Amino acid sequence: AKVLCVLYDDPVDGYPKTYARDDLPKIDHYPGGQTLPTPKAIDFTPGQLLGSVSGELGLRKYLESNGHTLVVTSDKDGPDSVFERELVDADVVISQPFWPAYLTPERIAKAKNLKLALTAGIGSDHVDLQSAIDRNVTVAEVTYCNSISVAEHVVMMILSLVRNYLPSHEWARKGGWNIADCVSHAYDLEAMHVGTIAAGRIGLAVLRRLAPFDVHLHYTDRHRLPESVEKELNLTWHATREDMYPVCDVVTLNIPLHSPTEHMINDETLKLFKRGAYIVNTARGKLCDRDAVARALESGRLAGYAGDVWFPQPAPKDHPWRTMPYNGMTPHISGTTLTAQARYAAGTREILECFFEGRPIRDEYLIVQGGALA
Template sequence: MAGWAPALDPERSSCQVMGGQELPGVLVSALEGPRGVCEGHVADLQRHFTLITVKEFLEDRTQLGPKIQAIYIWGGKPAVDRMLLQSLPCLKVVASSGAGVDHLDLPLIASFGVKVVNTPLAVSSPTADLGMALLLAAARRVLEGHQLAISPDTQDFAVNWMGQDVAGATLGIVGMGTIGYKVAQRAKAFEMEVLYHNRHRRAVEEEAAVGATYCARLDDLLSRSDFLLVALSLTPQTRGLIGRRELRLMKPTAILINISRGLVVDQDALVEALQTGVIAAAALDVTFPEPLPRDHPLLKLKNIILTPHIGSATHQARRRMMESLVEGILASLSGLPVPNEVLA
């Protein structure tokens, strides 16, 4: 939306609260299509809000701008920039689906007196489930096995075609937030030894509950892990955290799983590591960009599993996300304490 000319006076003091029975206006990317809100959620949203699409807003900014009190971000859209914020004098809250907020300029939004909410609790369990699914699939070479089983050229199954044990292996978790901790809970059930590296150490009781050992130095975790799972938020400090040096500290039999953000891992270094046997394999739910260009070298490797950023992609989780966003918007518009508020 860059390049808009502000259609309205940006002074928030001129904003009038909508009267009568009119539902508060909420800006959404679209009501259908691959970048729109979930079609199965539209009726629920319309019980609480008047949904205004970006296309409708662009066609009549003067009339619709003052009606929009919230922005509903689904799948990272619509983008929120200064021009848009200046065009919405009554905006009170930006409600963003998912846990990550790296697509939002939090200080900029806060400077307009606008709150931000997200849905970390709604996505934590399904994302942890996918992390374990990727770990298991990579360890047991599930996709390769599937291709072997269905190939028209297959005449018999090689008895020495093997993967790696999960039970008894060491899992290193980089980022022991809500999602990382849920991965540790699942790993315990698989009888894995769990190591973790985090900005802050968790309570001893929390460590004991999942049998996790804290590694103050990332290097120690890297050298000891059979599986390395990355579950970090993307920040300037975590961008490129797993690079060429870190990959070379890992075991040549190790497998990397990334369920955080693509930019946390140096993709060029990862391609090199996978091509040269520095590590055995990788399983990624996230890349940069998404999707990758169709000629990207990661797409040509056999020792990698790629999924299309589906950590929270279950019917149940997406409904919880929608309900959480509705709760956050309504609380903000009513002046009540806002659940899952993200501070700049």
Template sequence: MPKERLSVFVTRRLPEPVERRLGELFDVTLREDDVALSREALVAAVKTADVLVPTITDTIDAGLIGQAGPQLKLIANYGAGVDNIDVETARSRGILVTNTPGVLTEDTADMTMGLILAISRRLPEGLATMQQGQWTGWSPTALLGGRIGGRRIGILGMGRIGRAVAQRAAAFGMQVHYHNRKRLRAETEDEYQATYWESLDQMVSRVDVLSINCPHTPSTFHLLNARRLKLMKPNAVIVNTSRGEVIDENALTRMLRAGELGGAGLDVYENGTDVNPRLRELPNVVLLPHMGSATVESRLEMGEKVIINIKTFDDGHRPPDQVVPAML
């Protein structure tokens, strides 16, 4: 008698090739539209599915996990970050959690450099000038930005993405500095020409560009608070393609409005889609809709990892991208 297929519930629309392959392998429930599920719909899903495939827009907390049926054995997150999932509670209930690490690295690092260039070279202002038909011709003093070659970049979080940013920054002639929970090995520092700072305060006070590349955890919430932001140079640029909660967004907004920072490039926000409206008014700020990893390639590779994790689990083996609390 053939083995009964796993019941898999996917919370958002995924690329068509990914959805098609899921349908070939499992008894999959897909979405008709592409909006975040309500809490009620998520509860219904965990009561019936063997495997849940959520995204960052789904809050899989202790309360939701507590309502899961006994058949739910795997939460295969479509994304690298798992701060939307209570991994500890899931583990205590015998539910495995997996993610999709590694596939977002290059695209997110590219976007980080794009934001650094956009702010440093005042690309939004130039674009607005052209779109509004206000350009009257070249001028020696118009829209003067700053050369990024020779500037110091401070990277907060030297994981995969942080190292990819370091590699790109070095190629642009920037001096690479970093702060991390653990210092990299000497040969790795040499590879990226990176200088380690044990003190985050000392690093942020000396860099010209600060790139946020650490995950959101209880220990990194508001790591860039008002006090620490005030240590930065008044012409420094801050870029965040990681998690919005790492920065005190209100404090950042106040400093930008007061001219106490040179600019900011943000792809993520402290309160999700509820972005501080005062940020939108500032010419030296670039705001993007969480598109750091938004390439066709990364979305397909994320889907492939989800499928491999589910298939490996279905075959009775440990999924390759299993997340355990000790990793967080």
């Protein structure tokens, strides 16, 4: 079988020979009881860069020693890409949400051998599920692999925005001091009101991490949490987003998106936010209208905006979110720390081991199986 794996580029100075640490902290299960990936062996050392082209998710020795071929590339866009060329006979397709190879209906029609579409990470919005069903293609992902990673990124960005960390650090780097210039936009997070639009794996990990900061926690969702959990973390429920925005000092947008309406945060909806509110958006770039946010930060209606998702993606070099006032942006990297890479590389092999050996793939990994959802 031919396995076609799309990964992002190597570092500027080349693939790393040495790393900052020797191993990763021991973790056994996710919050809720789901165990970490359980392949029968790995050919990488946890902590290596696996999501880049030279890392190959640690898969080559496993597949080549079993008679399979592995084609790794970063060229994924357009009909003339390496991906679309190798896709015609590819049995398995692997890519990450951070550098995704889209399986459009057109492309699936061209994939005459396709049997398995594997997401090295979380999310399958790049895969047309209807075409997979019609072609009996299995669609799986490594569920829960980086949910905690995203939650850490969010809490860090909340603190950085409220406390004015990034301009303050620049004063240190440029050789200045300027205490008053640092702190005239700096607040404590304590006792602020923080709300999340979804209480999933990410949203609930964020809620638990914000609690000891003595903030007032709010949330909306499709579906309420048990009042067991609402009691434990002393949460306020809102039936709609719009009911939650005006009471919140900080709003975080994560997945799952109940109603993915593009531009659901725009100039009109931003009138519902308190003056000087903060938004942290890791869900999707087009959830917020690009210029409404930029206007809001330049006018002071928003006191800060941070996130790692953009539109378009990757962002052009003059994207306003790169340099607008009081932004805490990073590239799309939050769920691909070296730690998260070890988990979804292990999960990728566990899925490939189950697939090639004819064993059942984990129930929680499956999105589409044998011609229907799973």
